[PDB]
Design an enzyme around this catalytic site. Structure first.
Site, PDB file in Angstrom:
ATOM      1  N   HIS A  67       0.818  -1.250   0.000  1.00 10.75           N
ATOM      2  CA  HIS A  67       0.000   0.000   0.000  1.00 10.75           C
ATOM      3  C   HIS A  67       0.841   1.284   0.000  1.00 10.75           C
ATOM      4  CE1 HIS A  67       0.046  -0.564   4.537  1.00 10.75           C
ATOM      5  NE2 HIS A  67       0.283   0.747   4.468  1.00 10.75           N
TER       6      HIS A  67
ATOM      7  N   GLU B 201       0.787  -8.391   0.611  1.00  8.75           N
ATOM      8  CA  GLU B 201       1.048  -7.031   1.157  1.00  8.75           C
ATOM      9  C   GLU B 201       2.538  -6.715   1.306  1.00  8.75           C
ATOM     10  OE1 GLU B 201      -1.299  -4.994   0.808  1.00  8.75           O
ATOM     11  OE2 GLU B 201      -0.392  -3.231   1.848  1.00  8.75           O
TER      12      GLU B 201
ATOM     13  N   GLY C 217       1.136   5.398  10.870  1.00  6.24           N
ATOM     14  CA  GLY C 217       2.547   5.814  11.023  1.00  6.24           C
ATOM     15  C   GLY C 217       3.485   4.648  11.320  1.00  6.24           C
TER      16      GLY C 217
ATOM     17  N   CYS D 225       3.404   1.598   9.774  1.00  5.42           N
ATOM     18  CA  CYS D 225       3.497   0.678   8.615  1.00  5.42           C
ATOM     19  C   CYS D 225       4.953   0.545   8.160  1.00  5.42           C
ATOM     20  CB  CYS D 225       2.557   1.093   7.498  1.00  5.42           C
ATOM     21  SG  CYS D 225       0.838   0.871   8.005  1.00  5.42           S
TER      22      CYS D 225
END
Length: 182
Positions: free
Chosen positions: A41, A72, A146, A148
């Site tokens: 992402h 992911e 924040g 990730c």
């Protein structure tokens, strides 16, 4: 504070950079040579900022399992003039549960941040922001935005990168040794 934090600090001090895309600032784990990982992402493009330096992306691959399900994890090869310490021998070979993990973050918003998250479950399937995702690890810590790309470790193992949360639980994508064979 103890040996888990010791191992986490050793990884942060040598194997992380601050990555910036158009979607934000992320903790980015360097694994070997010029190869790093970031949550998919983050939407890595042809150019990324690494510690505030404009850096060409030589390759970026958004991983999916053999069922064509999102994992992911994006593997990024950076046009950088310096290699990472090779930490592939700290990656697990198989999917597993863990005790006593630490989540470690380093950004402009959260410098030198370490969190003892406790027990980590092999959760498996997660609908992550509407996207079916596999190989998810879960910890019962109320993780926020924040964090990730934050690194999940145990003593001697680098097991995942933080990709999301639901306000009470946090979720990490697994790192497996087989993602980084060359």
């Amino acid at each position: 504070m103890g040996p888990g934090f010791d191992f986490a600090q050793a990884i942060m001090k040598k194997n992380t950079v601050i990555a910036r895309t158009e979607k934000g600032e992320f903790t980015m784990l360097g694994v070997y040579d010029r190869v790093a990982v970031i949550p998919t992402h983050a939407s890595v493009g042809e150019i990324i900022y690494i510690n505030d330096v404009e850096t060409r992306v030589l390759d970026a691959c958004a991983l999916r399992d053999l069922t064509d399900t999102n994992l992911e994890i994006t593997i990024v090869k950076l046009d950088r003039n310096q290699k990472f310490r090779d930490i592939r021998h700290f990656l697990p070979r198989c999917e597993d549960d863990y005790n006593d993990a630490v989540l470690s973050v380093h950004t402009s918003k959260f410098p030198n941040m370490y969190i003892p998250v406790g027990q980590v479950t092999n959760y498996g399937f997660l609908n992550l922001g509407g996207t079916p995702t596999h190989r998810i690890l879960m910890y019962n810590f109320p993780t926020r935005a924040g964090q990730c790309g934050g690194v999940v470790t145990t003593t001697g193992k680098v097991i995942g990168i933080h990709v999301g949360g639901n306000g009470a639980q946090g979720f990490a994508a697994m790192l497996l040794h087989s993602y980084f064979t060359d």
